[PDB]
Enzyme design. Structure first.
Site, short mmCIF file in Angstrom:
data_model
loop_
_atom_site.label_atom_id
_atom_site.label_comp_id
_atom_site.label_asym_id
_atom_site.label_seq_id
_atom_site.Cartn_x
_atom_site.Cartn_y
_atom_site.Cartn_z
CD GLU A 162 8.34 -7.91 -0.27
OE1 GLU A 162 8.22 -9.30 0.18
OE2 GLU A 162 7.22 -7.26 -0.22
CG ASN A 178 23.32 -33.27 -4.48
OD1 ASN A 178 22.32 -32.72 -3.87
ND2 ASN A 178 24.36 -32.68 -4.67
CG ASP A 237 18.75 -31.40 -4.18
OD1 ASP A 237 20.10 -31.02 -3.99
OD2 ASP A 237 18.37 -32.55 -3.75
CD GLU A 297 25.97 -27.16 4.87
OE1 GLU A 297 25.43 -26.31 5.44
OE2 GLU A 297 27.16 -26.98 4.20
CG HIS A 325 -0.52 -1.65 7.54
ND1 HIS A 325 -1.53 -0.49 7.28
CD2 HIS A 325 0.18 -1.82 6.41
CE1 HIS A 325 -1.49 -0.20 6.12
NE2 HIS A 325 -0.51 -0.70 5.59
CG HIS A 326 3.79 -2.92 6.87
ND1 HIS A 326 2.73 -4.14 6.87
CD2 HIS A 326 3.56 -2.85 5.40
CE1 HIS A 326 2.14 -4.62 5.65
NE2 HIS A 326 2.79 -3.81 4.93
CG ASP A 359 -0.71 -0.23 2.46
OD1 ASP A 359 0.39 -0.92 2.76
OD2 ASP A 359 -1.22 0.84 3.24
N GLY A 392 27.62 -15.87 0.09
CA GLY A 392 27.28 -17.41 0.06
C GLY A 392 25.95 -17.71 0.73
N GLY A 442 19.64 -33.75 -1.37
CA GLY A 442 19.99 -33.07 -0.31
C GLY A 442 21.23 -31.91 -0.25
#
Ligand SMILES: Cc1ncc(C[n+]2csc(CCOP(=O)(O)OP(=O)(O)O)c2C)c(N)n1
Ligand SMILES: Cc1ncc(C[n+]2csc(CCOP(=O)(O)OP(=O)(O)O)c2C)c(N)n1
Ligand SMILES: [Mg+2]
Ligand SMILES: [Mg+2]
Lengths: 542, 545, 97
Positions: free
Chosen positions: B49, B453, B426, B459, B112-113, B26, B399, B455
């Protein structure tokens, strides 16, 4: 060995947190192991951090405390908006942020997730205005600091932030012996009497409760208070369900001149107003068209209060509310207004906005939580009378679209025994849709209604009805679960166009507590609830 | 009437910005109207955003300036992470934040916000450490303030923030006459001579260029400099493509002890190092295993520089680089390293990590932009030698996973003539997938490879290979376009398991410039590029408790 | 030469006959002065044009002079020329039959 990580998790358990949300990163992997190890704590990993923060918020709403884990820099800054919204509407959320080893931070290295300026303190500083307490843990200060910030959470029920360096999480610590954390007493006693005296005298009192009641899980207290006294009560939409709406003395939602006329007249002709945990915002007061005369009003909030325009600073919000039970000889003998409960009769007529909410009101059952996103959904849903032992989640102050999807899921996880009904618009679902994955994994069973009105209708109602920025790419919403790897034994997908179809699917969904429902409602773009026809003109005025 | 809004947009046009990204609210509608009305500016609305901010970043990488619009509070705080990443890697992005009318802000209303504390200044304060300049516009200060902050963008090429209240956007102002934006009293002249003198004397010099070169769109300058001189050059992965990799004197990517041996030895045995626009980060220096002796090195950066361990404060980065072209009697007469490049012969063998990137290197064509997400994709893709007139987008300093998807799309919009090839895992795609909507709407034609792969492999390589926190819900990625409303005349969806299938789909995709490709690659969870086998052990070593 | 000056980024390849080149050859001077780098193929069929750059004061750092008679020679010189964007190439083709 017992570690700082262990300490933090045990502390979190004491707050009643049974699941931790978030997203792994290299700087929080080892602590993530610790969560796994703790049998009294379950890891529920999200697709993104923002979604995690929203999901923790929803969890807090229901479980009354929550926590999520992110990684330094990229994780925490993704979640900041959701944490902000937890500050704004006063939800007790712990954010844990795994950070590089103190060795790395001290040497000020250009490591990933930094601005390559060797400063590790920017992001916590950025969290200042939206946290009640923050800490960067060290091996020395850890137990003290954890306890300090978790105490602040207990005091204020606003979110708190813990930066947890890899090595600090692995450092030795002793199990906590004392539990987690009063002063003002004579002024609490005075206040109670003034409340009681006012209530005994009032010929037509109104209790108005708000969001802060939910913040402290005082809903049952308030309900029991209203029950014994039979006092008239209303809530704002900012704090819908801070009382059991099924009570006979609950009037409806007070929302400025957008209130139903009878309620409006009742509230605004009251001779005494008791407001508990309320904040008057644009969207909760019909664009500030509320008439709550301060001179005949006692208002209590977490941070402050007023007795007839005389500010109080010194009191304990929680026990002051609790004490409302220990009053005496309050019994309201007056009239109320009128619950015109009229069964919905469906036709083959296409689904309209006003008809939808009429149907939802009639078909909703007990022991349900209703979650509604800003837009047509919030406007329509907030006006409904809930059934007994029901709950409501809306975020009308912070007003972040996308919120309700993750929040719904978090809340649902928080209480498996309350059947969640989500009402989210097409526009909003686009922000946070990825959490559909988690929904499928965690085998939770909410009833999700997607209101496909081919864009941002609420925006179209404020300004620019035919502008291209109000159109959104049109997905095939019903086919989304399949894409995210759901089968028909997990999620049931529907498309609803008519009233009969709606009624049928509602009953069918509520009849099947073992599957999640993904229901795509087709409403027209021009179609908006009566409430919004007006409120949209008022937003434009602002 | 001509308005502040108009002023801002015209200024943005001068920076070369032709599209503005973001999400309506708004408090930013109405200014949104103004964007529509400006015929030289196109609105490209995102789903969220954060995605918008990432998309603006990618746009900046290619177009060399970018802008996106959010709404006060919920919008700006959603985007902050992307803006942070634009600060970290030094991209010129304008964030415009539509805010409530100054009447409302002054009356300090619970609208609001906000935090219902009547304070309208929190969120700008939160943006302090990740913006080179910020401003809350007023009717009076607007033109001055817009010009101040847009100037800072030009100076530093870091992101800037403009808070635009509804009524301030609608307020009168005059068209800008003078354009936007010395010599450091030609203190640059001394530096140039020292560089030139050093280069004439060096028996084996190395130029190392970095991200700041991309920041200022100096890639062509550097390429032309290296071409005439025939100077040996390498880049970090933090700034891959700051030079045309097809040049004969480009050695490859220098990444600490993870560098190919010959390059490693060349760089680290050089007698003179000229580093331009470089920052040495953990991921770009093989966990700080770089050996760049400061005593035989001149480094220039935007903010500062060093001549043989002697810091200089006073110079103009951009023109100092530009001046490298006016050096003379520079010509390298030495050898390079053996750039022996082989040929990929595919089989029916299932697709492995190392083989994938070998195939990508062999099959990539000229005038392409390659975007690679952190994880297996970045590790593999960054080592590739690009073809002539190609570009690379990776974000190894900040990163932030998910980035490359929106970024790819932004960049693609920035230059329709450069075919984008996205390599995203993925795990990462899950963060930002919703922008698939925009891709379909905008009828842009990138080649998207999704590396499934099962996952977060990277990691799994750092810590906890078998832990449940490294599993992600498995979507059917190939069937995503259909869900988002794409037909076969817009997006082509594939699943690839073998080498032959990969080669075939690569060529097929590159052969069809008029459709977007959505290709799901099936790689094993255990599979990682040679580079990462090592780098993952090194990440763990950094984070030893 | 003009075109090459117009766009330094486009590598010019000239195909001209020895007969015609004679009419405007004097501009070889400008080519040397302006340090531009076109690939000039002069097809044979009355003067000895091979050593013209040398006459106009060019060194091997400026202009590379070649004679091509065979297919292998042609391929080799083409690639060599295109591989070196920093020098002008003065290539005399002798065509068969
Ligand atoms: C995070 C965020 N971004 C943008 C906005 C601005 N905004 C408020 S409501 C709305 C439209 C949402 O429309 P939809 O979800 O389709 O609901 P409808 O009114 O059409 O039922 C937008 C864009 C916001 N409130 N929060
Ligand atoms: C925004 C953000 N959240 C979390 C992280 C931590 N992180 C870095 S790489 C990675 C895993 C990436 O997995 P995927 O995209 O599947 O890559 P692959 O399996 O191909 O290695 C994670 C979680 C991050 N870098 N950025
Ligand atoms: Mg909608
Ligand atoms: Mg992956």
């Amino acid at each position: 060995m017992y570690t700082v990580g262990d300490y933090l998790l045990d502390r979190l358990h004491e707050l009643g947190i049974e699941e931790i949300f978030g997203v792994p990163g290299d700087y929080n992997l080892q602590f993530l192991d610790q969560i796994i190890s703790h049998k009294d704590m379950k890891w529920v990993g999200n697709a993104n951090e923002l979604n995690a923060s929203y999901m923790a918020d929803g969890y807090a709403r229901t479980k009354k405390a929550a926590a999520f884990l992110t990684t330094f820099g990229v994780g925490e800054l993704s979640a900041v908006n959701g944490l902000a919204g937890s500050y704004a509407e006063n939800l007790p959320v712990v954010e844990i942020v795994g950070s590089p080893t103190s060795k790395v931070q001290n040497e000020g290295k250009f490591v990933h997730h930094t601005l390559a300026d060797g400063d590790f303190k920017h992001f916590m500083k950025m969290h200042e205005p939206v946290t009640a307490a923050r800490t960067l843990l060290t091996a020395e200060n850890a137990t003290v600091e954890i306890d300090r910030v978790l105490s602040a959470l207990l005091k204020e029920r606003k979110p708190v932030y813990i930066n947890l360096p890899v090595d600090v999480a692995a450092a030795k610590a002793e199990k906590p012996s004392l539990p987690l954390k009063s002063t003002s007493n004579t002024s609490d006693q005075e206040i109670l009497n003034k409340i009681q005296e006012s209530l005994k005298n009032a010929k037509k009192p109104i209790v108005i409760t708000g969001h802060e009641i939910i913040s402290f899980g005082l809903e049952k207290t308030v309900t029991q208070f209203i029950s014994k006294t039979k006092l008239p009560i209303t809530t704002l939409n900012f704090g819908k369900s801070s009382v059991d709406e099924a009570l006979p003395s609950f009037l409806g939602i007070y929302n400025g001149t957008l209130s139903e006329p009878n309620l409006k007249e009742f509230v605004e002709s009251a001779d005494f107003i008791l407001m508990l945990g309320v904040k008057l915002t644009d969207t909760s007061t019909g664009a500030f068209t509320h008439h709550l005369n301060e001179n005949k009003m006692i208002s209590l909030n977490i941070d402050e209060g007023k007795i007839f325009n005389e500010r109080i600073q010194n009191f304990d919000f929680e026990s002051l509310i609790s004490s409302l039970l220990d009053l005496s000889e309050i019994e309201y003998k007056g009239k109320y207004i009128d619950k015109k409960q009229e069964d919905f009769v469906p036709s083959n007529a296409l689904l309209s906005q006003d008809r939808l909410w009429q149907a939802v009101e009639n078909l909703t059952q007990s022991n349900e939580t209703i979650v509604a996103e800003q837009g047509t959904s919030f406007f329509g849903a907030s006006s409904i009378f809930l059934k007994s032992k029901s709950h409501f989640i809306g975020q009308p102050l912070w007003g972040s679209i996308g919120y309700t999807f993750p929040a719904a899921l978090g809340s649902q996880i928080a209480d498996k025994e309350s059947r969640h009904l989500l009402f989210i618009g097409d526009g909003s679902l686009q922000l946070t849709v990825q959490e559909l994955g988690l929904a499928i994994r965690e085998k939770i069973n909410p009833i999700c209604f997607i209101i496909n009105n081919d864009g941002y209708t609420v925006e179209r109602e404020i300004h620019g009805p035919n502008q291209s920025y109000n159109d959104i790419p049109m997905w095939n919403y019903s086919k989304l679960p399949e894409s995210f790897g759901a089968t028909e034994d997990r999620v049931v997908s529907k498309i609803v166009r008519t009233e009969n179809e709606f009624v049928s699917v509602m009953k069918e969904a509520q009849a099947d507590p073992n599957r999640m429902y993904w229901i795509e409602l087709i409403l027209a773009k021009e179609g908006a609830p009566k409430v919004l026809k007006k409120m949209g003109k008022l937003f434009a005025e602002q």
